[PDB]
Amino acid sequence: EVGTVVQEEMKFRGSEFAVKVEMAERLLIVEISDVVTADQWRGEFGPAYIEDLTRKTGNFKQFPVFCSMLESAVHKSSDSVTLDLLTYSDLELLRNRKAPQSPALSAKRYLILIYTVEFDRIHYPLPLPYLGKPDPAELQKEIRALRSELKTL
Amino acid sequence: VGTVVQEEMKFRGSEFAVKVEMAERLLIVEISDVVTADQWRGEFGPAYIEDLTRKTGNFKQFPVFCSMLESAVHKSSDSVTLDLLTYSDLELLRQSPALSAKRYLILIYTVEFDRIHYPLPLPYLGKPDPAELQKEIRALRSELKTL
Amino acid sequence: EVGTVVQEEMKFRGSEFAVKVEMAERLLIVEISDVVTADQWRGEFGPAYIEDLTRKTGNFKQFPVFCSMLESAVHKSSDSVTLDLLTYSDLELLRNRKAPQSPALSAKRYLILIYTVEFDRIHYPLPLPYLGKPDPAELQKEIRALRSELKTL
Amino acid sequence: VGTVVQEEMKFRGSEFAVKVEMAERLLIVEISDVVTADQWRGEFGPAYIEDLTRKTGNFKQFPVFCSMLESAVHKSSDSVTLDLLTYSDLELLRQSPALSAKRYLILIYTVEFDRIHYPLPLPYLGKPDPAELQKEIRALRSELKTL
């Protein structure tokens, strides 16, 4: 963690997404992009949110460890952690079958950090709001910036 | 060859990204509304450009012409200036949905007591697929990291 | 678990001990014997004690899972769990240096169930009261029982 | 050979575990106080046993003698009975700490109009190392599981 940014492409249920995790001073940022449809979700989580979230699972983690787990899962560099991406409808079925949708919730995606060790099987859910498609202006506005820095060197 | 100029310029109350690029035997002119991200694009050959300049009265050779257009975009010459206007705006100076959309980049050349107007037709491309734009943003970001 | 009894010999810090774990209906029993000096400690723990004990560690386990972990550690059949045996003096130093003894506490041993997985490092402590040396009568009384059952078959 | 008898019996207000075992050319007698776990043990050869029985008056051959002692422990004969008493109790019928401790298993043989008293000296072993006893308990428990 400590200022670092990890971004990788990965396929969730037969679709390429761009995933960007960024650990900053007392804030974790997750950003996902549908690379085919350019749809986007983003989440911001504080150390309190995160730690209190893991406590709910009975399997606590401290904020830096969690971010480190997440980094590891994005990097696919650790067999004990894995990701998944779900919709609220999907999310209920895997907990409702175990035993009414607003605009913001309906488009929401849940990034599920999945922790598997010899005696625990834990799912840590990170809720990501639908952020819309981006503005093709600003993308171009921004591409015109990168083009010049590239030519500078 | 391959020389590229990119500059920002205003055309009748709006901001445009103008990119001109001279390949061998091909002039490429792209125009984007920096705000609405509307894009227009022309590709012109030597034969076309020389045929065009004569038609208007003051023929220039293709390299010389591109060169002027490069100066115009650098705003680095008095003899040349640019305008941008529609088939309606052009009609008055002298329509299908395609025509209603396309733009004309005018190279306004000054000599002696008169000004010559060189119209380049630039077709409409549409707005871009922002997916496509992000994939390309991803590529440029990886060029910078390694470098 | 569910009625089962596991007993094995194992060396803690250069001494052979006999360890006996027994999982019964809502009660876990741990019994340790110094095989050279015949000293003995025993502990009985309920599902509430155990579960509330794991919660304290931030890394919950349900009673049957914990007993199963413990069985696994005694059986040395799982790389993620290991045992250790400590005295209260030992126990403090590893937590006091990280930053007055009654009879019953002084002779007490702590069986430390040690859980190591990719992102957690947990020590689960089971306190065992010193039960004295056994009565050589009852041992003999009992050996005279086994001798006859053996000859019966 | 190898025949073993184990029975419980009372001797002057106390409970004892008596084990008698006839190997070839050796009689083994062990006695344990089932309560205090005090243990006494004798090992007697044929020559010793025959020399002993004559001394007392009514010689028996070694196999015959052991056999009687086995009957005595099974309490399965009228002619024989057992007692257990100390060098002090024995003196009266006719001391270093070792002697003060040791016991005598008496085989009381009845014939015609008299009773013959056969004393076997059984040394003190001490109480046992309960460590040792547990190690042995562990061994027997593993014999039973497999079987």
Residue numbers in the entry:
A (entry chain B), C (entry chain B): 2 to 100, 110 to 163
B (entry chain A), D (entry chain A): 3 to 96, 111 to 163
From the paper:
The highly conserved coiled-coil domain-containing protein 61 (CCDC61, also known as variable flagellar number 3, VFL3) is one of these understudied proteins. Our crystal structures of CCDC61 demonstrate that it adopts a SAS6-like fold and forms oligomers through two homodimerization domains in a similar way to SAS6: an N-terminal globular head and a parallel coiled-coil domain. Further analysis of CCDC61 reveals that its coiled-coil domains are capable of directly interacting with microtubules.
To find out whether CCDC61 can form a ring in a similar manner to SAS6, we determined the crystal structure of zebrafish CCDC61 (residues 1–170; zCCDC611−170), which contains both its head and parts of its coiled-coil domain, by X-ray crystallography at a resolution of 2.9 Å. In the crystal, zCCDC611−170 formed a homo-tetramer mediated by the head-to-head and the coiled-coil dimer interactions in an arrangement that would not be compatible with the assembly of a ring. A filament model of zCCDC611−170 suggests that CCDC61 would be able to form protofilaments with a left-handed 3-fold screw axis along the filament, the helical rise of which is ∼80 Å. However, instead of the spiral/ring assemblies observed with SAS6, CCDC61 assembles into linear filaments with 3-fold, left-handed screw axes in vitro. Comparison of the structures of zCCDC61, SAS6 (Leishmania major [lmSAS6]), and Caenorhabditis elegans (ceSAS6) and human XRCC4/XLF by superposition of their head domains showed that the difference between the exact higher-order assemblies formed by these proteins originates from (1) altered relative orientation angles between their head domains and (2) altered relative orientation angles between the head and coiled-coil domains. Intriguingly, in the filaments formed by CCDC61 in vitro, the distance between the projecting coiled-coil domains of CCDC61 that point in the same direction is about 24 nm, which corresponds to three times the 8-nm repeat of tubulin dimers in microtubules.
